[model samples]
Target: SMSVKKPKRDDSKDLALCSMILTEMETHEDAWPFLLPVNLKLVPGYKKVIKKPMDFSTIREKLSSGQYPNLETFALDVRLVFDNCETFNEDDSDIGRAGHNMRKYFEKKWTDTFK
Candidate 1:
């Protein structure tokens, strides 16, 4: 019989994933559809802003207003989740696909939203 061994968790990889997620969220409007399904409710007064196309300045202002404090910590948590998924040899095909799609979305948003 053949046995499968699991991979170990990599903190750096987790951090990278976290950074990627946050950056993508920060820059992309298309991401809102996916994110909205995940229950990512923004602070009051900011919902309209995030929903109407992508605006870097509005996002930055909202973030600065402490709507999503401890961003680095949140990123770390996301990284840990990705790391764990990789370690247990879990099927992450969906996640990988989402990441690719989000990357394209982020690129477009970054180019258009940023000055």
Candidate 2:
């Protein structure tokens, strides 16, 4: 579904995902060092650890970008639908298995912290 024409709200997410990933890259419990994968002079505004997120900005040599978009997207992901987890299980391909657990946790609809 990738296309060249930018939707009013599309290109932004992919760009920002990488930014969020870089932030995570720094402090992931299983983290390893990585460089900014692309070149756009984008010095992401926020690099704080949001440990659960698969979820950043800088501008005019100043800080004023929507750092929360990635956060919001992730929230919506687990909040809006558990459908992704229906197929994301141990029987599948060997990749990002940790995320599937979080998906399972939400699919079971916990109201708060795990018991």
Candidate 3:
């Protein structure tokens, strides 16, 4: 039997899953406001509220360079984008609604793919 304590580091499938979900999110209709980092000059208050800002652009960059060690790491960054949006934007607002929509989409896809 394979040793469970080995803690194998196979990420090929993880990489594929992350890439697939990210691609779909990028093309989603509500993907705006999360495509890139927030503009601090325009929304300085954002800097105060959200300490670590995450966006599709940054995630894509990290994915491109294989920065994530596992699927969970990738997912964490993806979740951060929506979480930050919710923190700074109201649910009825454009950006906040987009975050919720995206999070819902991502979760559905995540379950369909991984579960």
Candidate 4:
């Protein structure tokens, strides 16, 4: 005889802007197409701030050397992405509003879990 095991419950949750809504906004020309792209575009000169051509090598060296950066830098990077999401608003599109709300939700979720 074999016994069945119950599935584990998932406590994790996610909050994200609905992709369908963004598609609708795009189809209606409510926002600039350039605002939403498959690849992220950085502002002129801003690339220097986040770009690290040797990030992989640096990480490898750090791990081999038994050193690691603090978690604050990782958290700050996520926050920067969330903040930058607000730059794509148009007069009629709700993308910016949705993004803002989603970011707040994420912040609350993160705080609840980690803080």
Candidate 5:
């Protein structure tokens, strides 16, 4: 008899980052594009991060490497991303909850890394 196992759709580590980025999209307005292209404006920190031109594999590759000088900076950068989402977006909208969840995920997900 062949048995089938359904994989769980819950992947907190990955989801947290994607969710945070999505929140960033919700927060930012106009001049919406942030990327590394032949001719275009790039976000200031794009160089520090990987080819994250809104790419998933790029993010995974970077995160697994444990990028950044130290845990503090990395944690802070990620936290700041989520925080900025909260700050930029409307609190009365779903953006608030998304940002809040992103923060909570970061804290819980990187507990050992930060410590």
Candidate 6:
């Protein structure tokens, strides 16, 4: 005989949701600018301006390591990626435009799936 019951501290669902959203973002064409952390040496002044740098690779690493206690916390980090991009790049620049589109894509899916 067997029984089915919910675990007291289950994170499977949240993990799945985060993974799904992340995969989509990774494949999104506009995700170029946010795929990795900025090269501080190449992009001068970025380190001074952006206090907390966030990127998809870092986010994936955090998720894999169970660093996020909840989806809301995970969402915050994702938002930080876009915020940092906006801060460092000009709105008319290619990277900046990509950030705007990527942000819109993530937020809409986040709302549709989480809200």
Top candidate (lDDT):
6
After superposing candidate 3 on the true structure, give the runs of residues whose Cα lies further than 4 Å from its correct spot: 1-11
Models sorted by TM-score, best on top: 3, 6, 5, 4, 1, 2
How should the candidates be ordered by lDDT, best one leading? 6, 3, 5, 1, 4, 2
How many residue pairs clash in each candidate at the backbone level? 0, 2, 0, 0, 0, 0
Runs of candidate 4 with Cα error greater than 4 angstroms are 1-68
lDDT of 2 by residue, 1-115 (tens): 5676655654444545444433543343422111212222443422232222221112111112544344444445333222322333243533234445444544343333212
Q: Please give the distance, in angstroms, between residue 40's alpha carbon in candidate 2 and its true position after superposition.
A: 16
Cα deviation at 51, candidate 5, in Å, is 21
Tens-place lDDT digits, model 1, residues 16-39: 443454666745543433333222
Pairs with backbone N, CA or C atoms under 3 Å apart (clashes), candidate 5: none
Q: Model 2 Cα displacement at 110 (Å)?
A: 7.6
Weakest lDDT window of 10 consecutive positions for candidate 2: 54-63
Superposition TM-score, candidate 3 onto the true structure: 0.88
TM-score per candidate, in order? 0.27, 0.23, 0.88, 0.38, 0.41, 0.88
Residue 1's lDDT within candidate 3 is 57
CA lDDT, candidate 6, residue 99: 92
Judged by TM-score relative to the true structure, which candidate is superior, 1 or 3? 3
lDDT of 4: 0.40
Compose the digit string of candidate 6's lDDT tens values, residues 1-115: 2787666765558899889999999999988888888898998898898999999999999999989989989999999999998888899999899999999999999999877
Residue pairs with colliding backbones in model 1 are none
Prediction 6 TM-score vs. true = 0.88
**lDDT (CA) per prediction:** 0.43, 0.34, 0.88, 0.40, 0.46, 0.91
Model 1 residue 5 CA deviation (Å) reads: 58
* Weakest 10 consecutive residues of candidate 3 by summed lDDT: 3-12
